[PDB]
Amino acid sequence: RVTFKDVGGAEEAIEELKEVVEFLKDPSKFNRIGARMPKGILLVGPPGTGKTLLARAVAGEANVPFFHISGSDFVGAARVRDLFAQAKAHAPSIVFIDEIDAVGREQTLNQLLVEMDGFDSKEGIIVMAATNRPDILDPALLRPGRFDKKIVVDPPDMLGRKKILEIHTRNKPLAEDVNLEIIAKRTPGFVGADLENLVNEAALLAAREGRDKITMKDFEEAIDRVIAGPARKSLLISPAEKRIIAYHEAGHAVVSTVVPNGEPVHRISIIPRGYKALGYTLHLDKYLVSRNELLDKLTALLGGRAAEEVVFGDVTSGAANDIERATEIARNMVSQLGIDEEVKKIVTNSYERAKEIIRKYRKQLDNIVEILLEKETIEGDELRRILSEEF
Amino acid sequence: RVTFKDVGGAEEAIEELKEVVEFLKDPSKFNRIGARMPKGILLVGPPGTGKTLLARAVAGEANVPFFHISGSDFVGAARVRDLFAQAKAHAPSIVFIDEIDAVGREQTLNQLLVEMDGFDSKEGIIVMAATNRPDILDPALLRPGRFDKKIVVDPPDMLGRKKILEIHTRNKPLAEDVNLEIIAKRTPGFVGADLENLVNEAALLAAREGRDKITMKDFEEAIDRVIAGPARKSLLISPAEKRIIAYHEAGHAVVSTVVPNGEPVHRISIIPRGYKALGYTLHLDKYLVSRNELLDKLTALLGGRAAEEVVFGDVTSGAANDIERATEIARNMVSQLGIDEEVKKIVTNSYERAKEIIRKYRKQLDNIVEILLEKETIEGDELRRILSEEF
Ligand SMILES: Nc1ncnc2c1ncn2[C@@H]1O[C@H](COP(=O)(O)OP(=O)(O)OP(=O)(O)O)[C@@H](O)[C@H]1O
Ligand SMILES: Nc1ncnc2c1ncn2[C@@H]1O[C@H](COP(=O)(O)OP(=O)(O)OP(=O)(O)O)[C@@H](O)[C@H]1O
């Protein structure tokens, strides 16, 4: 049995799931005013971030049964039928499906659609699923009444990684020289699954020497063992890669602050945070189409690529995604504001515009990167103040 | 079962459909004087405006059966045959087809044309269809005797949005501080489908806290949830976009009032209202062709584009449609009143003429925009009076 005390660095996701817990505890409070709940919820994120652990914590916060099946184990139609029959016999319950993209061969899919339409939501039943490849799902699953809510689960930041280390060392004897805050600063790019395996390695080092406490030297030796060798499990960002990433993020923020139509900036970080930054489209944005605001949007979208070329003469895979999105926007502009030759010149002009801004404001770019390399994240209150002294 | 009491902001469309209700209740009153009814009717409008709901309200006002099929589900010929056979067995009835542009692959289309020609209109049978892409329909469907009547369904205005909110809150308990008139003023650009989803969101906020009434704070928090995030459904016009739109509409009205041949102005609004304003040609205008009236028509058609350039130095997608229509008119002028070099200079001269009027009457332009930004619409009685004090 697990609850929300076993989860670290997922504050925003836990905030959206509070409504589901209230519904499962007493459905009648929703029915008496006509509030209608969704039938399916989708969790999307990279592997090892704790999507299976979040679903089990919902069923623990409310004492309800938990029926589950894995989509990688696929007689298939008969198994789906049995799963939904059990959930109906116990009114408030949860149905969970893992690796849904594997199963959604055509007889099994049809049975699931039939089962989704054939149960009553007012009884207190809800279905959950998880995946890390949301863009290959069948469009029939996402139609209204089947799977209409989505929640994003992100990799942790420095304060999130420290919380996960504390959760998994509360039953282990530690020496007095252990500083979990220093250990967190040395593992950017780790996820919760990597951090849980690191604690086991440090305990094996102590046990093999007969000691009864884990020291600070054990933790530092375990980091090197999990990132190299014939048996490696984890990747981390090196100091050289950290510098190139910092310049890419600061290039976006500098260009936005200079163009008149640019949007406000609220956060800069080394770890990706949104669904766009994670590479998802989610099968998905202004009422009015104007020439001046579309050109300022193109210039700011190329700010990361322009800082890489003026400082390093290189190009990364993130900058290649940016150049692809820009071409799509320019193509739609030509067909609405008044062919391939025209699209190519629009993108070229915006790229030249961004490089002049980077050159003219090179001093402010350097100052921001230095702060980022030591803090790893700048938030709204501090970011707003910092941007004032510069510029 | 639904009737005309479940529909808001569609007064003009409901006025045209009253004839259809009388015909279905007693066909003999039309036959005894030789009045001949159309065989098909077409509803055209943006998605979510309630075209499917209007058809079901016609079949409820008169107690007649309602046979329907969706064109996005396309054996096809056999299904069309069955649908029309059922309708004949019950004399006064309705046949409805949704997403007709999807189905109108060639065997299905031929069967529909055969069925349209093979039923007797005097029995009390009529066919209805709906679409939001009227300009890609096959020309064979629109010939006389098949689909010869069209009705336009528009997005709602401020008073229309207030009526839809009242329809969907008549079974819900509301607090005493709720003011549906203030909520309507804060959602320009919403349609009836967006407004129905907003009421469900405000009820979920109240239920998750255990309360038994919906307060004014719930409604204001629901607006922010539906316009942003990984799960967004609606778009609204922002205060910055509102100002640019107001100047475009007032530029047309000012130029018309000054040129001697300009047409009278009856209405100005922020929401589009006609079929021309919605971007439809409808496969469709004076008996006499004169030089002076054609030049005054060109100058007034460029008044919206001229106000954008003199006040903001920008250009929108609506102004690009205007410049395209102007070129077509000038091209036809050259071939009738006495080549590409000639057309280009005619359009350039008219554009220069309109900019001088905007500069010379800048004071009256500003006064009209201020009233529009607070009322959102000026009608004939008030508009006529207002235009008198100015000028
Ligand atoms: N935030 C977290 N706090 C604590 N443990 C975590 C967290 N995230 C992941 N873990 C650990 O990750 C291990 C496995 O990850 P889990 O299966 O829960 O995630 P997942 O995203 O569903 O992964 P996968 O795609 O591999 O199935 C669990 O044992 C749990 O200990
Ligand atoms: N004027 C209105 N009054 C009340 N409800 C409305 C109105 N217009 C739309 N709706 C709501 O819109 C919802 C769906 O829209 P509907 O299918 O009737 O319109 P449509 O134009 O045919 O849409 P679509 O293109 O999506 O099929 C209905 O549940 C109805 O509640």
Ligand SMILES: [Mg+2]
């Ligand atoms: Mg797992």
Ligand SMILES: [Mg+2]
């Ligand atoms: Mg519909």
Ligand SMILES: [Zn+2]
């Ligand atoms: Zn980038």
Ligand SMILES: [Zn+2]
């Ligand atoms: Zn115009």
